[PDB]
Design a protein around this ligand. Structure first.
Ligand SMILES: [Zn+2]
Ligand SMILES: [Zn+2]
Ligand SMILES: [Zn+2]
Ligand SMILES: [Zn+2]
Ligand SMILES: [Zn+2]
Ligand SMILES: [Zn+2]
Ligand SMILES: [Zn+2]
Lengths: 397, 387, 395, 365
C-alpha cells in the first residue's frame, strides 16, 4: 500500500467528515428537524399526549398567578494586624422633605469569633421592597478587642464588589481584615474494491461523528443511510460488519425579488474499469493484457529509420563511416547513456553487442576512429580504449 | 468578507435542503412543493371545499398575493388537490388572476362573505376586490379595476383584519403612526371610494400588526415597533388612550394572534427572537416566552382545529410549531438536547425567508407556507407525532 | 524538346498490352469462383423510389435498421516520441582500397563536427550546430591509410611506440619508430567559448540568467558553474541545492544521492533523476468526459510525484505563431510555451499526456527543468490521483 | 476515328429524400448471366438496385442506420472465400466501416479505428479478404475481415499533411497509390516480405487460442512522393497497368508515371523526385471538391462527370491518348452536379449519380 491512494483515501474521508463535523455543531445549536418526531427514531421521546386531553388554556392564568403569590454567604477570615467580628446591612434611603438628614438603618446580622495575627448566611434579605426607597445598601463590619463600610448595592441595582476572597481596611472610632463574598459494530472502508482500512466500533451504537445515543441498530442504519449521504453503507451480520463506499453521483448544485418559472415537485402522498485504447493504433485494449507488454517503451522503428535516412542523406561521408554511425546510434538508442563515466562501459558493450557485425563488414578502423573521436572530447581514457580493442581483436581471431 | 460567507451559507442551506428532501418520507402524511411565477407575501386557505364522491381527493382554494418588479402584479386565486384518507397524484392549478395596483403586502378574506377580499398596496390607498364580479382572466392592458377602494393612511404597511361578527368592519395599519378602520356596509353600490370612518393614533412608532377580538366586537388589539402592545376599546370616544397598554417585549413586536376556541388568551411574536403568550384578563404578567427561533419572527397563527397549538415563522428559514399542553413538562436529557419539550415540530424545508403561512379551517394539522424565493409549500404532519 | 511523342505512344501501347493480359488472367481467376446472388425479404419506416421516365411504376420497400455503434472523438494522425525534436577533398574510406594520406585535423572533420557532446550521437534532433573545435584540444611498406592511422595514434599518444605496436598489432615497434624518425620536419542553454579569459559579463551564460555546466569549456575553478547536490536522501525538498533553481540532478556531480548507480534496476534513492532514467508511469488513452480525448493513469501517484514529461518539436516563437494560425481552422492547439527562445509544438508528434484538457479545478501541473542543458518539461501531480482518473493541468 | 459508341439515356430515377449522393459501385465479383446488381448511397440511406434491358430498375434492398446525422461517402462489393456469399462494405462520417451481408439483411460485422470521416473504401483484387480504408485523419488503414482484425496503417509522419481523399490498388494487387488535399501522390507496396508475413500472421491470428495483442506493422516511409504534379486538391487517382491517372480542380486529367520513361515501376527509390507527364485529357467545370471518375474491369474506356451534368467519356484501346477522340453526353434535365459513375463487368451498362438525388443510366446500342 503506497502512500498515494492512502493520501487520497485520507482526503476523501477528510472533506465529508469535516463537513459533517461542522454540521454536528450546526444541528446541535441550530437543529434542522427534531429527531424525536422521526418514525424510526421515537424512543428519544419520553412522554405522550395524555396531558392534552385534560388541558384548559383559560385556566392557565391562575397557575402563573400563584407563582406570583441572592444567597449571600459572607465568610470571614483571619485579620492582618499586629478578634470577633459582626456583619451589618446599612440601608441608606432617599431624603424626605421633612427630614434634612438621610434615613439610615443598621440591621446587624450576628457576631462570630474570628482569629487574628465563621460565616453568615443571608437568603435574599435585601428588604428593598422595590418601592423607590432603598438608595443604597452597604455592608458594615463591626469589630473590637476598627469599623468600616462598603457600598454593596449600586444605584441601578448593580453589584460593586466581586465574589471570592477579598480584603478591606478599617478605621477605629497595615491594619485590615479578610473575608469571602459569594452571591460490536465494525466499519470496513472500501474504495476501488480495496480493503484500505479495517476498524472496530468502540461504543455499541454511539455514532462515530454525529454522536447520538440510539438504542437500536436499525435506527442507526437508517440514520447513516438517509443522513450523511456522501457515503453508502451496507450491512451483513458477520462479526457487526458495515461496508462503506464513496458515492460518486452526488446532487451538488444550488437548489434554489426575482422571477423564476413555476414547478410542482411532489415526492410523498401516502408512503480501473473503463475501457482503453492503444496509442498508435487506437484499437480496443483487452483487459487481459494491460500490465504486460507496456506500450510507449522499446522506442519505435520510425526513429531508427529517421536516424538512418538523415545520416545517409549526408553527401561528404563515406560508406563504412555511415555504417558505424548507424551502429552507434542503434547501440546508444537500445541502451541510453547520459552518465559520462558509464561511457567507459558503453564501448565495452559495443564489442560485446555488435563486434561480430563489424568483422562481417570490416569496420574496425573507423570504429577506432570513432573511439579516438569521443576520446578527443575527454569522455574516456586511452587505456580503456586499448582494453576494448584488445578484447575485440582477441575474440576476432 | 460577507459575500463569501453568504455563499458558503447558501451551500450549507443546499446541503440541508437535500437532506430534508431525502428525509421527508418519514415525517409528513402529505407534501407538495410548488413554485409560483412570482413570489407571495400572503397565503390563506378559504372555507369553500368540493368533494367529488367518485374521486378520492378533495379540492381546496387559496388566496395569494404577489410582489413583482417591472411587471404587472397578479392577485392569484388558486386551487389545490388534497388526498383525504387514501392514495402519487395531485397538482396545483391557477383559477383566477386579477390585476393588482402595485405589489401586495397583506390580503384577507371576509369570514362573513368569502367572495370579498381586502388587500393592501405599496401606497396609502388599500382596496377590496370581489372576484365573482370580475372575469376569470386578467386584462392585458394592465389597467386594474378596483371594486372598492379605501383611503385614510399616508403610507404602506402590513396590518389588515376583518371583523368576524360585524359585516364591513375592517381594520388596517400603516407605518405613518395611524390605524384606519372602515365600514364598507354603509356606502351605496355606486360609491367605489370610501373615506376613513375612523383613524386611531396612540402609538409612537411603526405599528406592525392589528387584529379584531373574536368573541367581543367592541374592542381589538395591536402591537407596534415601540416594544408595545395596546388593546383598544371601540366603545370609548377617545382615539388616543387605549384600554390597555403594555411593554410586552424587549424589542420591536412584529405579529399577534387571538385564539379561536378561547377568547382571552392570545400570542405575539417579536423581533427579540421570541414568541410570547399573554392573557386578556391580566396583561401585566408575562405568562411564557417561547425562545427557539433565532431571528425576527413575522407571522403567528393559532390552529383552527386545536386550542393548545401555536405556530411561528420568520427569516430563520425554519417554521416552528409548539404545543401548549406540553409546556413545563419533564423529559429525557437527549430529548432536551434537540430543543424544549413544548416545541412540537421544526419544518425546515424552506431555503429563504418564510414570508407567510396559514392553516386550513376544515382539515387536521395541515398548513400552507409561502417564501420570498418563489416557493409555496403545503404539508400535514404525521399522525404518530401528535396522535 | 518533343522527341518523345512516338516513345510515349510505344509506352502506351505496351501498357495496353500488359494491362490487357493482366485483365485476362484476372478474368481467368474470377471464372473459377461461384457465388450466390442477392435475395430480398417479402415486403416501421418505408422508402419509395419514383421514376421520371414513364412506363416504370413507383417501387416501395420497408426500411431495415442497422446495429448502432459507439462514436469516438476526432484525432489527427501522429507518432510517438521520447526525446525532443528540432526543425529549421573527398577523404575516402579508411578500409577501402582507394584510401590516401590525410592529416589528423582533416580526417576527423566530419566526426568532430557531427559528434555531439550532450547526447553522444551524430546529427541529433536538438543540437543544430557544434560549439567550437577547441573543445577537444588538450595540452617497411606504409599506405596512406596507415599513414593517417599512425598520425592520429602518435598525436593522441605523443610517441609511445609500444602502445601503437600493441594497438596496431601488425606493425611492430621498430617499424613505427623508424617511420617516426623520418616523419618530422528563461533562455536556452548554449555552450560558449572563452578558455583564456574568465567567465565575465561578455559570456552569454550570465546574459541568459543561467548557471554554467560541465559542457562549457571554461575554467574548472569558476563560480558560475552549478555543482550538484550533496543530499543523501531522495532530495525532493526545497533544501536541496538543485531544487532551488529549476535544474534537476546531475549524473556525475551528484554522487551523494547515488545517481551514478546502474540503471538496469528501478529502486533508487534519488527521486529527482526520473527524467534522465525515464521512470515514467504507464499512461493510457481514453475518451474524456469533458472535451474529446484524455489520458488515464494506471498506477496511483502521490503529491508532487513524477507522472511523465511533455515532448514535441522545438520551434521559434514566430514559427509557433504561424503554426497556431494554420491550426486555427482545425481548432487543435496543443502548444506549450517553454521559454523566450524556443517553444514546444506537439500536434504532429508527442505522447499521451498531450491529450489532457483545461479545467478550472486541475490536479496535475507542469514545470520546466534544465536536464543537462536541455530545457525539458516535467508533468508532476499537484494532488494524490487514483488509477483511471482524469489528468488536467493549465497550459 | 468515330465515336464507336451508341449511348442513349434509358432511365433516370429520383429518390424521395432530396439529399446529394456520394458514391456508386457495381457488383463486379458476381458471376456471368445472373441478374446484375448495384447500389447507391446518400447521407444515411443506402439503396441496392437491379437493372434489366428495358430500363426496369427493380428495387431489391434499402438499408438505413438509426443515427441520422451520419453522412455516407462510398460503397464497395466483395465475395466471401468460404461461404461464397456477397458482402457490401460501407462507411460514413461517424468513423465506422460496416459490412452488410444482404442475404441475411443484417450488420454482420463492423470495424472502428478512425477518428473522423471515411473518404473511400477499396478491396484487394486477388485476395478478397483485405480491405483498405481512406479517411480524413491523415492516414489510411488495412483490415482483414476473415479473421476480424487490422493488418497495417499506410500513414504516419511521412504521410499526407492534410485530409486524404482517395487511394487505389493496382490490378495485380502489389502496389497502392494514395492522394489527398496535401498536394501529394504517395506510393505504397504490399509485395515485400514484411507485408506478406504480416498478412500471414493476421490470417493465423486467434484471440481464443493465445492471449496476446496483434503486432500492428506501421509504415512511416512510403516508397515515392512528389509535390509538383498538381497545385490544387487532388480528388481521385487510379492505376492503369504501371501508370498513374489523376485529376484535380484544374479541370484536366493527367496520365504519368514515376521517374523517367525508362525507369521501371518496381525499382523506384524513396528519394526519387523526377516524373514524366505522359499525357493529358481536357475538360471543364469541375471546381467542386469530391469528384470521381471510373473504369470497367477490362478498362477499355473511362467515364467522368462535371458540376453541371454533361458527362464525358474517353476511349483507352486506341493509341494517341492526348489525340484520343472524346465523347460528350447531355440532357435537358441533369440540372445538378455529378459525383461518381460506374459500369458493370462488361462495358454495356453505365450508371451515374448526382447531387439532386438523381440516378441516370446509359446503355450501348
Ligand atoms: Zn542531442
Ligand atoms: Zn561561463
Ligand atoms: Zn563558466
Ligand atoms: Zn560558460
Ligand atoms: Zn538533489
Ligand atoms: Zn542528485
Ligand atoms: Zn539527490
Amino acid at each position: 500500500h503506497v502512500q498515494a491512494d492512502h493520501e487520497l483515501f485520507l482526503q476523501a474521508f477528510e472533506k465529508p467528515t469535516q463537513i459533517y463535523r461542522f454540521l454536528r455543531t450546526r444541528n446541535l445549536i441550530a437543529p434542522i428537524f427534531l429527531h424525536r418526531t422521526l418514525t424510526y427514531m421515537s424512543h428519544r421521546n419520553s412522554r405522550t399526549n395524555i396531558k392534552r386531553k385534560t388541558f384548559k388554556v383559560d385556566d392557565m392564568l391562575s397557575k402563573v398567578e400563584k407563582m406570583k403569590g441572592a444567597h449571600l454567604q459572607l465568610t470571614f477570615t483571619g485579620f492582618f494586624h499586629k478578634v470577633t467580628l459582626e456583619v451589618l446591612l446599612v440601608k441608606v434611603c432617599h431624603k424626605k422633605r421633612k427630614d434634612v438628614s438621610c434615613p439610615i438603618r443598621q440591621v446587624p446580622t450576628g457576631k462570630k469569633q474570628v482569629p487574628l495575627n465563621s460565616l453568615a448566611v443571608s437568603s435574599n434579605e435585601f428588604e428593598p421592597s422595590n418601592s423607590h426607597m432603598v438608595k443604597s445598601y452597604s455592608l458594615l463590619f463591626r469589630v473590637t478587642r476598627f469599623v468600616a463600610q462598603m457600598t454593596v448595592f449600586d444605584k441601578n441595582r448593580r453589584l460593586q464588589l466581586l465574589d471570592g476572597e477579598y480584603e478591606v481596611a478599617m478605621q477605629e472610632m497595615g491594619p485590615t481584615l479578610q473575608f469571602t463574598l459569594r452571591w460490536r459494530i465494525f466499519y470496513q472502508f472500501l474504495y476501488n474494491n480495496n480493503t484500505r482500512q479495517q476498524t472496530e466500533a468502540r461504543d455499541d451504537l454511539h455514532c462515530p461523528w454525529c454522536t447520538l445515543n440510539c438504542r437500536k441498530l436499525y435506527s442507526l442504519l437508517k440514520h447513516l443511510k438517509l443522513c450523511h449521504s456522501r457515503f453508502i453503507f451496507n450491512y451483513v451480520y458477520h462479526p457487526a460488519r458495515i461496508d462503506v463506499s464513496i458515492n460518486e453521483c452526488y446532487d451538488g448544485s444550488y437548489a434554489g425579488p426575482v422571477k423564476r418559472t413555476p414547478i410542482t415537485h411532489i415526492l410523498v402522498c401516502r408512503p480501473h474499469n473503463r475501457l482503453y485504447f492503444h496509442s498508435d493504433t487506437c484499437l480496443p485494449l483487452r483487459p487481459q493484457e494491460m500490465e504486460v507488454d507496456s506500450e510507449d517503451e522499446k522506442d519505435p522503428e520510425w526513429l531508427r529509420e529517421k536516424t538512418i535516412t538523415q545520416i545517409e542523406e549526408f553527401s561528404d561521408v563515406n560508406e563504412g563511416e555511415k555504417e558505424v554511425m548507424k551502429l552507434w546510434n542503434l547501440h546508444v538508442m537500445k541502451h541510453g547513456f547520459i552518465a559520462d563515466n558509464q561511457m567507459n562501459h558503453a564501448c565495452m558493450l559495443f564489442v560485446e553487442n555488435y563486434g561480430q557485425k563489424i568483422i562481417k563488414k570490416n569496420l574496425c578502423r573507423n570504429f577506432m576512429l570513432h573511439l579516438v573521436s569521443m576520446h578527443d572530447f575527454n569522455l574516456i581514457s586511452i587505456m580503456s580504449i586499448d582494453k576494448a580493442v584488445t578484447k575485440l581483436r582477441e575474440m576476432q581471431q | 468578507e460577507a459575500a463569501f460567507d453568504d455563499a458558503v451559507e447558501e451551500r450549507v442551506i443546499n446541503e440541508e435542503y437535500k437532506i430534508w428532501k431525502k428525509n421527508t418520507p418519514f415525517l409528513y402524511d402529505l407534501v407538495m412543493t410548488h413554485a409560483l411565477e412570482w413570489p407571495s407575501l400572503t397565503a390563506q386557505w378559504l372555507p369553500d371545499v368540493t368533494r367529488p364522491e367518485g374521486k378520492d381527493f378533495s379540492i381546496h382554494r387559496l388566496v395569494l398575493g404577489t410582489h413583482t418588479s417591472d411587471e404587472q402584479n397578479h392577485l392569484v386565486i388558486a386551487s389545490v388537490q388534497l388526498p383525504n384518507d387514501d392514495a402519487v397524484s395531485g397538482k396545483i392549478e391557477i383559477e383566477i388572476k386579477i390585476n393588482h395596483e402595485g405589489e401586495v403586502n397583506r390580503a384577507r378574506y371576509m369570514p362573513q362573505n368569502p367572495c370579498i377580499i381586502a388587500t393592501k398596496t405599496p401606497s396609502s390607498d388599500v382596496l377590496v376586490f370581489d372576484y365573482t364580479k370580475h372575469p376569470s382572466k386578467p386584462d392585458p392592458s394592465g389597467e386594474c379595476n378596483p371594486d372598492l377602494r379605501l383611503r385614510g393612511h399616508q403610507k404602506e404597511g402590513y396590518g389588515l383584519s376583518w371583523n368576524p361578527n360585524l359585516s364591513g368592519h375592517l381594520l388596517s395599519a400603516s407605518d405613518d403612526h395611524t390605524i384606519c378602520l372602515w365600514d364598507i356596509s354603509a356606502v351605496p353600490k355606486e360609491g367605489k371610494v370610501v373615506d376613513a370612518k375612523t383613524i386611531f393614533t396612540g402609538h409612537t412608532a411603526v405599528v406592525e400588526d392589528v387584529s379584531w377580538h373574536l368573541l367581543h366586537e367592541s374592542l381589538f388589539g395591536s402591537v407596534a415597533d415601540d416594544q408595545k402592545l395596546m388593546i383598544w376599546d371601540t366603545r370609548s370616544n377617545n382615539t388616543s388612550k387605549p384600554s390597555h397598554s403594555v411593554d410586552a417585549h424587549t424589542a420591536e413586536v412584529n405579529c399577534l394572534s387571538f385564539n379561536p376556541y378561547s377568547e382571552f388568551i392570545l400570542a405575539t411574536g417579536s423581533a427579540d427572537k421570541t414568541v410570547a403568550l399573554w392573557d386578556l384578563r391580566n396583561l401585566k404578567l408575562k405568562l411564557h416566552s417561547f425562545e427557539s427561533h433565532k431571528d425576527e419572527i413575522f407571522q403567528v397563527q393559532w390552529s383552527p382545529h386545536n386550542e393548545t397549538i401555536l405556530a411561528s415563522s420568520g427569516t430563520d428559514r425554519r417554521l416552528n410549531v409548539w404545543d401548549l399542553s406540553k409546556i413545563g413538562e419533564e423529559q429525557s436529557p437527549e430529548d432536551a438536547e434537540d430543543g424544549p419539550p413544548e416545541l412540537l415540530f421544526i419544518h425546515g424545508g424552506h431555503t429563504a425567508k418564510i414570508s407567510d403561512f396559514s392553516w386550513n379551517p376544515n382539515e387536521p394539522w395541515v398548513i400552507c407556507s409561502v417564501s420570498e424565493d418563489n416557493i409555496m409549500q403545503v404539508w400535514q404532519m404525521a399522525e404518530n407525532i401528535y396522535n | 524538346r518533343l522527341q518523345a511523342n512516338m516513345g510515349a505512344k510505344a509506352l502506351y501501347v505496351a501498357n495496353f498490352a500488359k494491362v490487357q493480359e493482366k485483365t485476362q488472367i484476372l478474368n481467368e481467376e474470377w471464372k473459377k469462383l461461384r457465388v450466390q446472388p442477392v435475395q430480398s425479404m417479402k415486403p416501421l419506416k418505408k422508402c419509395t423510389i419514383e421514376s421520371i421516365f414513364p412506363g416504370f411504376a413507383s417501387q416501395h420497400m420497408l426500411m431495415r435498421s442497422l446495429n448502432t455503434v459507439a462514436l469516438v472523438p476526432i484525432m489527427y494522425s501522429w507518432s510517438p516520441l521520447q526525446q525532443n525534436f528540432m526543425v529549421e577533398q573527398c577523404t575516402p574510406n579508411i578500409d577501402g582500397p582507394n584510401a590516401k594520406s590525410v592529416q589528423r585535423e582533416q580526417s576527423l572533420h566530419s566526426f568532430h563536427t557531427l559528434f555531439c557532446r550532450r547526447c553522444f550521437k551524430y546529427d541529433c534532433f536538438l543540437h543544430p550546430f557544434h560549439a567550437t573545435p577547441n573543445v577537444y584540444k588538450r595540452k617497411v611498406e606504409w599506405t596512406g591509410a596507415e599513414e593517417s592511422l599512425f598520425r592520429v595514434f602518435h598525436g593522441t599518444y605523443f610517441n609511445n611506440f609500444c602502445s601503437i605496436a600493441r594497438l596496431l598489432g601488425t606493425k611492430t615497434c621498430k617499424q613505427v619508430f623508424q617511420f617516426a624518425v623520418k616523419e618530422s620536419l528563461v533562455y536556452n542553454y548554449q555552450p560558449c567559448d572563452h578558455p583564456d579569459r574568465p567567465c565575465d559579463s561578455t559570456c552569454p551564460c550570465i546574459m541568459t540568467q543561467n548557471f554554467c555546466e560541465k559542457f562549457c569549456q571554461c575554467n574548472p575553478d569558476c563560480q558560475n558553474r552549478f555543482p550538484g547536490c550533496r543530499c543523501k536522501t531522495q532530495c525532493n525538498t526545497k533544501q536541496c541545492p538543485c531544487y532551488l533553481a529549476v535544474r534537476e540532478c546531475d549524473p556525475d556531480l551528484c554522487l551523494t544521492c547515488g545517481a551514478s548507480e546502474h540503471w538496469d534496476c528501478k529502486v533508487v534513492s534519488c527521486k529527482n533523476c526520473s527524467i534522465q532514467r525515464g521512470l515514467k508511469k504507464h499512461l493510457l488513452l481514453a475518451p474524456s468526459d469533458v472535451a474529446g480525448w484524455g489520458t488515464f493513469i494506471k498506477e496511483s501517484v502521490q503529491k508532487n510525484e513524477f507522472i511523465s514529461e511533455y515532448c514535441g518539436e522545438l520551434i521559434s516563437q514566430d514559427e509557433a505563431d504561424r503554426r497556431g494560425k494554420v491550426y486555427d481552422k482545425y481548432m487543435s492547439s496543443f502548444l506549450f510555451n517553454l521559454n523566450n527562445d524556443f517553444v514546444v509544438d506537439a500536434t504532429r508528434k508527442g505522447n499521451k499526456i498531450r491529450f489532457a484538457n483545461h479545467s478550472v479545478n486541475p490536479n496535475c501541473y507542469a514545470k520546466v527543468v534544465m536536464v543537462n542543458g536541455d530545457h525539458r518539461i516535467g508533468i508532476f501531480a499537484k494532488r494524490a490521483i487514483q488509477a483511471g482518473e482524469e489528468l488536467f493541468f493549465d497550459y | 476515328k468515330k465515336c464507336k459508341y451508341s449511348f442513349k439515356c434509358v432511365n433516370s430515377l429520383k429518390e424521395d429524400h432530396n439529399q446529394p449522393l456520394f458514391g456508386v459501385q457495381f457488383n463486379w465479383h458476381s458471376k456471368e448471366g445472373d441478374p446484375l446488381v448495384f447500389a447507391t448511397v446518400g447521407s444515411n440511406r443506402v439503396t441496392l438496385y437491379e437493372c434489366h434491358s428495358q430500363g426496369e430498375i427493380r428495387l431489391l434492398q434499402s438499408y438505413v442506420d438509426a443515427d441520422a446525422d451520419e453522412n455516407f461517402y462510398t460503397c464497395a462489393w466483395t465475395y466471401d472465400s468460404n461461404t461464397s456469399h456477397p458482402l457490401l462494405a460501407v462507411a460514413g462520417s461517424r468513423g465506422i466501416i460496416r459490412i452488410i451481408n444482404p442475404i441475411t439483411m443484417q450488420c454482420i460485422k463492423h470495424y472502428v479505428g478512425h477518428g473522423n470521416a471515411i473518404n473511400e473504401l477499396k478491396f484487394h483484387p486477388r485476395d478478397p479478404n483485405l480491405l483498405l480504408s481512406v479517411s480524413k485523419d491523415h492516414a489510411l488503414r488495412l483490415w482483414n475481415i476473415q479473421t476480424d482484425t487490422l493488418v497495417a496503417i499506410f500513414g504516419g509522419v511521412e504521410g499526407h499533411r492534410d485530409e486524404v481523399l482517395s487511394a487505389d490498388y493496382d490490378l495485380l494487387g502489389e502496389k497502392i497509390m494514395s492522394c489527398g488535399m496535401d498536394h501529394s501522390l504517395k506510393l505504397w507496396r504490399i509485395n515485400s516480405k514484411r507485408m506478406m508475413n504480416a498478412i500471414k500472421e493476421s490470417y493465423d491470428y486467434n484471440p481464443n487460442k493465445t492471449n496476446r495483442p496483434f503486432i500492428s506493422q506501421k509504415i512511416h516511409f512510403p516508397d515515392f512522393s512528389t509535390r509538383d504534379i498538381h497545385r490544387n486538391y487532388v480528388d481521385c487517382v487510379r492505376w492503369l497497368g504501371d501508370l498513374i491517372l489523376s485529376k484535380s480542380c484544374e479541370n484536366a486529367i493527367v496520365c504519368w508515371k514515376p521517374g523517367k520513361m525508362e525507369d521501371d515501376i518496381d525499382k523506384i527509390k524513396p528519394s526519387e523526385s523526377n516524373v514524366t507527364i505522359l499525357g493529358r485529357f481536357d475538360y471543364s467545370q469541375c471546381d467542386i471538391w469530391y469528384m470521381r471518375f471510373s473504369m470497367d474491369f477490362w478498362q477499355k474506356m473511362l467515364a467522368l462527370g462535371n458540376q453541371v451534368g454533361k458527362l464525358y467519356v474517353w476511349d483507352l484501346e486506341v493509341e494517341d491518348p492526348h489525340k484520343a477522340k472524346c465523347t460528350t453526353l447531355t440532357h435537358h434535365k441533369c440540372g445538378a452536379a455529378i459525383r461518381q459513375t460506374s459500369f458493370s463487368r462488361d462495358s454495356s451498362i453505365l450508371i451515374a449519380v448526382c447531387d439532386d438525388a438523381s440516378i441516370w443510366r446509359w446503355d450501348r446500342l
